[PDB]
Amino acid sequence: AIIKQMSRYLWPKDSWSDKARVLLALSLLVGGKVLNVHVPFYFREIIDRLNIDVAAVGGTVSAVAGAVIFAYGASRIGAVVSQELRNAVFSSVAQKAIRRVATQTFGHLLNLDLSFHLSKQTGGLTRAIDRGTKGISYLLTSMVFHIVPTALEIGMVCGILTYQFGWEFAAITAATMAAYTAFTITTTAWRTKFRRQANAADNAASTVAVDSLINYEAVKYFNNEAYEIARYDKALQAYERSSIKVATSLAFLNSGQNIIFSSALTLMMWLGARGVLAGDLSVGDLVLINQLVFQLSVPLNFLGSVYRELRQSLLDMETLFDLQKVNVTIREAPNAKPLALPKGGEIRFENVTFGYYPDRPILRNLSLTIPAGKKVAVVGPSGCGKSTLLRLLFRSYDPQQGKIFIDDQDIKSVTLESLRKSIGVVPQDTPLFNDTVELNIRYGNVNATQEQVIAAAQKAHIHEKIISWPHGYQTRVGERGLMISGGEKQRLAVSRLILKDPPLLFFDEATSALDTHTEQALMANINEVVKEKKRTALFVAHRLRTIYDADLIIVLKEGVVVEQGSHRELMERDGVYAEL
Amino acid sequence: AIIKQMSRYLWPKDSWSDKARVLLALSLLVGGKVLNVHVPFYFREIIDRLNIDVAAVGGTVSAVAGAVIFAYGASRIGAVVSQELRNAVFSSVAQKAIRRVATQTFGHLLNLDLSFHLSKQTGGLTRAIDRGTKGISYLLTSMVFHIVPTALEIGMVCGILTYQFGWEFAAITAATMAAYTAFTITTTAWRTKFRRQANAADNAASTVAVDSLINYEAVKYFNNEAYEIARYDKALQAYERSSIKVATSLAFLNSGQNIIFSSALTLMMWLGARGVLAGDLSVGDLVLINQLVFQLSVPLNFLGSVYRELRQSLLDMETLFDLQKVNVTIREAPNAKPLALPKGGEIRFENVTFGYYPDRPILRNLSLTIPAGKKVAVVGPSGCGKSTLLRLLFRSYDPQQGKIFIDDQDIKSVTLESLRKSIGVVPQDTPLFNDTVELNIRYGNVNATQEQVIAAAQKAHIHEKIISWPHGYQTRVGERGLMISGGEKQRLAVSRLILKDPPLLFFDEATSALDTHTEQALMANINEVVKEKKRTALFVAHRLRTIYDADLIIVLKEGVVVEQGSHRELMERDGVYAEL
């Protein structure tokens, strides 16, 4: 369709060295097929040069026919070396084009907003990348390795047999190619029934075996071992009756292909023999005809798998380039200015309503104000949407109506990357990369040096903990690494937040693990990293007891701002710490 | 080794029709190779019959060379049809021999005692069966499909070229075959490094992709999308530098193979050309030499996979026939008599000590007596070994010292199948086959009819429950079926016990699900199936409250029989129902 020219006319043609390698691959393709059709010409030159009066004019080899013997051998060697060099060169080209496609699509996927990554089963995007790149691999691979060389050689053989022997040799060669391809495609589409039935019956017999070996006690308690042997034997009989059809249909495929092609070679033998006894041809031309058509029979092993797998690969290519056409719903404003970093960072909310699936809102005409340079908390019941303040103010979601101000300009008018540089985040469930502790601390600022990571782990009080690990700060940590508690994960996220050093800071349920003393220590250490450096910290916790010492408290009751105050005057609401 | 003659000389030679099919396969093998070497003989007969004075003695085709043209075509067709018919016939033979091997080994595995099935990771025996049968399949398949036809054709080609042209053509053909096989084996063993490295680098790049798409929020919070694109690009570059080595080494393999074989064909061309100008040969004999050696080049695609995979298949065959040499530790006594079924069934224990891993015993010099025709329970703390009374009295384990009597003869002297027919079992965790409810009830006596299953489900009061299921008593039940509570599983086991109808009955923790009313109903229904039919029932429960109404109670305190009695006089021990 249009997908083939979407791939082939953009990625294999981008620079000079890649275009030079594509031209090298095409020149090796045509040179290989030229040498391949020169092999039978030199073999008939051997035959017709040695078909002389031996006792009269035949002197010696390397004066009668040595040049064409060496040319037959060299053309044979060069015709396969050019195929293999063409395959190596175009595998290089296809792998580079696939790398550029996958890199661009992955960069686009990371550039899409959060709602796409929540509306997709994770790990399925990687499956789409992998199947799409294998689809591009298979379509370029079986178009340059198999289909184009075969069609070029069919064209050259029909042209040669037309030019030297007549149109009917090309007619029989083209009809042979058509009938061989039609037979192979049709009966290979027929054989997949038998292959899938044999796989299903094999799995059925193996499941009878494992279902009778799981239940071994129940087999022995009721004396049904002979019955289960009979069940296994019946399942294996039904397996072998399908493997019979697999091997029988493979026999039919192979013998039908060679019956077609041997009928071709015998008919062309008869027509060449008619030509030789008419004086037109010679006995070398018989072997020219036979070897040209037979050399067409050699590379046609691809034709079994091709017709299903280019369809599958075009589907996978369609999914990959459909991923590349997803647009982002959050638009950076044109001529957006990075601004208000040197200003005293205040965050102002005006009449914003937000909701996932906007028929039900989560925030209901909310308006708050974070004063500049101060530490402010917002609290509420577990489920009131205070976790949906990050995503609206980090601008991974957009407010449906309303405006957000950071030092008196809109966050929909600042450059998005500057806004995300200004905000610092300690999330709820801190995710750990399957990599070292050193990378999971250096992720706050990847250009920072080693002793900066040392000082940042020192500031969060985890240096003794990572020296206490066996490999030191090189420890394999994460899902497939050394498993740790959630408190150390939170403190790792804190150390990342020192390494970013942003102006504005969020701590959205930063203290939400199990043990209360751990979150008291966490609140303590984030309190010394908040103070004395003008970090306009914002806090979210469902436990107002843990954020009791804040400079300013705002409450959120069902999407509205209700009251503001201090510890004791706002401790009066429910959810008290009396049951703790 | 000895494994090859252990397989090939027993299972392919068992009956007349199988031996007739093996002889048919061997005759098709030799006939196919005879026709294959007659193809170039007829082609040189075409060449030498048309190499006449055309204007003088050449009359017409089908009087000069028509017979050998048709014989060339027919020999070509027959030489591939005989290969395909040989492959179909021997695939039939190999599948039947594999079915007999797997059936015998599965019957042996069910005939092994319980300790083997506990000392084996379940589902690994099925893996041993499957890998061993695929090993037998691959060794017979690549010995009759590939290796024996190739070695036979090499022998026939070297014999023909010796008989007609001289010993040096056979020397060059054998050296060609040796060098081609050595090169293909060596460089295919070399290429697996590159294939495995490319697979590892592909998996590394895909895991970088999924590890950066799992953590998408953390990527966006710290502005490291360009860093993760760079990480993905580095991983894909390290993948393509290994796929370069895969395709380059494949190019080296294919071009080296054809350089070897084209050097052979050119050298034999030179020697035949030397022969033609000496008067010995003719110009058809050139094509005889060329086509014989080239037809040796055709079927050698097997040689890549063969050397590793026969080693793997011999290992799998070794595991399968090692499974078949496991002996049973419980020996049926010679001249054992089935006896004491018509006697009033009493079970007598005398001074038996048992222990799993016999350095620690579980039963400590125990001796009890079950009176004939009565309902007797044994109880103790959870872990005292009352669950190890079944396995000692069903004789799935043997007592280390002591003797067991069923109506005054040893259970080590009765025929084992008669003993297991006499005992009836309701186990602790009743296992359900992944099949119908009707099979899971008919498993008590597989020869019983439908309305017997109806009456047995009626006797256990589950008929309303199975009619209440959607498919009726044909319901798919088990692990992959309609999941049910453990009480219905226990009541299913009860219905199996009606369908067996044994003389002696066990109910080892038959009532051990969650809900107490369910086990009270279970105890009630098994009490009506115990009474009024002289079933010498034995009971095990950790809850003595649920077996409080027994005719006789024996207690077990740490492997000894301590006291016997009734409900209130033995209710005095701990674990009372006061906390229930």
Q: What gap in Å lies between CA B327 and CA B320, rounded to an integer?
A: 14
**What is the DSSP-derived secondary structure letter of residue B410?**
B
Q: Classify strands A347-354 and A423-424 as parallel, antiparallel or unpaired.
A: unpaired
CATH of A347-579, one of 3.40.30.10, 3.40.50.300, 3.30.70.260, 3.30.1360.170: 3.40.50.300
Closest-CA residue to A267 (of B83, B61, B41, B79): B61
Q: What gap in Å lies between CA B259 and CA B267, rounded to an integer?
A: 12
Closest-CA residue to A577 (of A540, A542, A545): A545
Q: What gap in Å lies between CA A360 and CA A364, rounded to an integer?
A: 10
B361 contacts B354 by C-beta, under 8 angstroms:
yes
Closest-CA residue to B126 (of A235, A44, A179, A534): A235
Give B572 to chain A, closest Cα distance, Å.
35
Q: What dihedral angle (degrees, nearest 10) is formed by the CA atoms of A154, A157, A160, A164?
A: -130
Burial B471-485 (b: 16+ CB within 10 A, else e): eebebebbeebeebe
CB distance B87–A211 less than 8 Å?
no
Name residues whose C-beta falls within 8 Å of residue B485's C-beta, 6 or more positions apart in sequence: B513, B514, B518
C-alpha distance across the termini of chain A, in Å:
67
Angle between helices A306-323 and A167-214 (to 10 degrees): 70
Residue A213: which of B126, B396, B445 has the nearest Cβ?
A: B126
Q: Classify strands A476-477 and A401-406 as parallel, antiparallel or unpaired.
A: unpaired
Segment holding A296, helix H or strand E: helix A283-297
Could you tell me how far CA A453 lies from the centroid of its own chain? 33
Q: Considering only CB atoms, which chain B residues are within 8 Å of A326? A: none
Please list the alpha-helical segments (H only) found in B122-166.
124-142, 148-164
CB distance A218–B430 less than 8 Å?
yes
Give Cα separations from A404 to A349, A350, A385 (angstroms). 5, 6, 17
Residue found by looking up tokens 């103010």 in the block: A393
Burial A225-237 (b: 16+ CB within 10 A, else e): beebbebbbebbe
Q: What dihedral angle (degrees, nearest 10) is formed by the CA atoms of A556, A560, A562, A566?
A: 30
Instruction: Give the residue from A82, A92, A95 with the most B CB atoms within 10 Å of its CB, the best one to mutate.
Output: A95
Instruction: Give the residue from A283, A297, A492 with the most B CB atoms within 10 Å of its CB, the best one to mutate.
Output: A283
Chain B within 8 Å of A65 (Cβ-Cβ)?
yes
Other beta carbons within 10 angstroms of residue A354's beta carbon come to 22
Topology of domain A1-152+306-329 in CATH is: ABC transporter transmembrane region fold (1.20.1560)
CB distance B221–A420 less than 8 Å?
yes
Give Cα separations from A481 to A123, A436, A464 (angstroms). 20, 9, 19
Joined together, the tokens standing for residue A29 give: 């393709």
Q: Classify strands B401-406 and A363-366 as parallel, antiparallel or unpaired.
A: unpaired
Joined together, the tokens standing for residue B518 give: 């369910």
Has B164 been labeled as part of a binding site?
no
Chain A within 8 Å of B237 (Cβ-Cβ)?
yes
Backbone angles phi, psi at A423, to 5 degrees: -90, 140
SS3 B477: strand
A493 contacts A430 by C-beta, under 8 angstroms:
yes
Closest-CA residue to A225 (of B428, B15, B117, B460): B117
**How was it solved?**
cryo-EM
Q: What gap in Å lies between CA A109 and CA A107, rounded to an integer?
A: 5
Name residues whose C-beta falls within 8 Å of residue B332's C-beta, 6 or more positions apart in sequence: B415, B416
CB distance A110–B216 less than 8 Å?
yes
Other beta carbons within 10 angstroms of residue B4's beta carbon come to 14
Backbone angles phi, psi at B494, to 5 degrees: -60, -45
CB distance A214–B431 less than 8 Å?
yes
A64 contacts A58 by C-beta, under 8 angstroms:
yes
Name residues whose C-beta falls within 8 Å of residue A533's C-beta, 6 or more positions apart in sequence: none
Give Cα separations from B251 to A88, A150, A362 (angstroms). 7, 18, 63
CB distance A43–B99 less than 8 Å?
no
Give Cα separations from B229 to B109, B233, B235 (angstroms). 55, 6, 10
Please list the alpha-helical segments (H only) found in B215-277.
216-221, 225-276
Chain B within 8 Å of A10 (Cβ-Cβ)?
no
**What is the DSSP-derived secondary structure letter of residue B367?**
-
B353 contacts B401 by C-beta, under 8 angstroms:
yes
Q: What gap in Å lies between CA B459 and CA B451, rounded to an integer?
A: 12
Q: What gap in Å lies between CA B32 and CA B77, rounded to an integer?
A: 10
Could you tell me how far CA B187 lies from the centroid of its own chain? 33
**CB contacts < 8 A (A, B):** 340
Other beta carbons within 10 angstroms of residue A549's beta carbon come to 11
Rg (CA), chain A: 37
Segment holding A370, helix H or strand E: strand A369-370
Burial B304-325 (b: 16+ CB within 10 A, else e): bebeeebeebeebbbebbebee
Q: What gap in Å lies between CA B461 and CA A47, rounded to an integer?
A: 93
Please list the alpha-helical segments (H only) found in A298-362.
306-323
The maximal CA–CA distance of chain A, rounded, in angstroms, is 127
Give B541 to chain A, closest Cα distance, Å.
19
Provide the CATH number for the domain formed by B1-157 in this structure: 1.20.1560.10
Name residues whose C-beta falls within 8 Å of residue B330's C-beta, 6 or more positions apart in sequence: B113, B395, B396, B397, B398, B416
Closest-CA residue to B403 (of B436, B365, B429, B430): B365
Q: Classify strands B423-424 and B504-508 as parallel, antiparallel or unpaired.
A: parallel
Instruction: Give the residue from B49, B84, B122 with the most A CB atoms within 10 Å of its CB, the best one to mutate.
Output: B84
CB distance B54–A87 less than 8 Å?
no
A39 contacts A295 by C-beta, under 8 angstroms:
yes
Q: What gap in Å lies between CA B246 and CA B155, rounded to an integer?
A: 35
Segment holding A252, helix H or strand E: helix A225-276
Chain A within 8 Å of B56 (Cβ-Cβ)?
no
Give Cα separations from B131 to A19, A242, B139, B310 (angstroms). 48, 19, 12, 13
Give B244 to chain A, closest Cα distance, Å.
6
For B291, which residue in chain A has the nearest alpha carbon? A291
Report the alpha-carbon angle A187-A191-A194, nearest 5: 155
CB distance A47–B270 less than 8 Å?
no
Chain B within 8 Å of A276 (Cβ-Cβ)?
yes
Q: Which residues pair with A538 in a beta bridge?
A: A376, A506
Residue found by looking up tokens 């499956």 in the block: A127
Comma-separated ranges of CATH 1.20.1560.10 domains in chain B: 1-157
Angle between helices B225-276 and B167-214 (to 10 degrees): 170
Name residues whose C-beta falls within 8 Å of residue B553's C-beta, 6 or more positions apart in sequence: B376, B377, B378, B379, B544, B547, B564, B565, B566, B567, B570
Q: What gap in Å lies between CA B432 and CA B448, rounded to an integer?
A: 19
Chain A within 8 Å of B291 (Cβ-Cβ)?
no
Backbone angles phi, psi at B562, to 5 degrees: -105, -60
Name residues whose C-beta falls within 8 Å of residue B471's C-beta, 6 or more positions apart in sequence: none
Q: What gap in Å lies between CA B458 and CA B469, rounded to an integer?
A: 15
CB distance B218–A70 less than 8 Å?
no
Give B58 to chain A, closest Cα distance, Å.
6
Residues in A 254-273 with any Cβ partner in B closer than 8 A: 254-255, 258-259, 262-263, 265-266, 269-270, 273
Q: What gap in Å lies between CA A466 and CA A39, rounded to an integer?
A: 70
Q: In what order do the strands lie in the sheet with A560-565?
A: A423-424, A504-508, A536-541, A376-379, A552-557, A560-565
Q: What gap in Å lies between CA A453 and CA A490, rounded to an integer?
A: 16
Residues in A 205-224 with any Cβ partner in B closer than 8 A: 206-207, 209-224
A122 contacts B213 by C-beta, under 8 angstroms:
yes
SS3 B551: coil
Q: What gap in Å lies between CA B184 and CA B297, rounded to an integer?
A: 13
Q: What gap in Å lies between CA A224 and CA A216, rounded to an integer?
A: 10
CB distance B91–A278 less than 8 Å?
no
Q: What gap in Å lies between CA B573 and CA B580, rounded to an integer?
A: 16
Please list the alpha-helical segments (H only) found in B475-515.
486-500
B380 contacts B386 by C-beta, under 8 angstroms:
yes
- Resolution in A, one decimal? 3.1
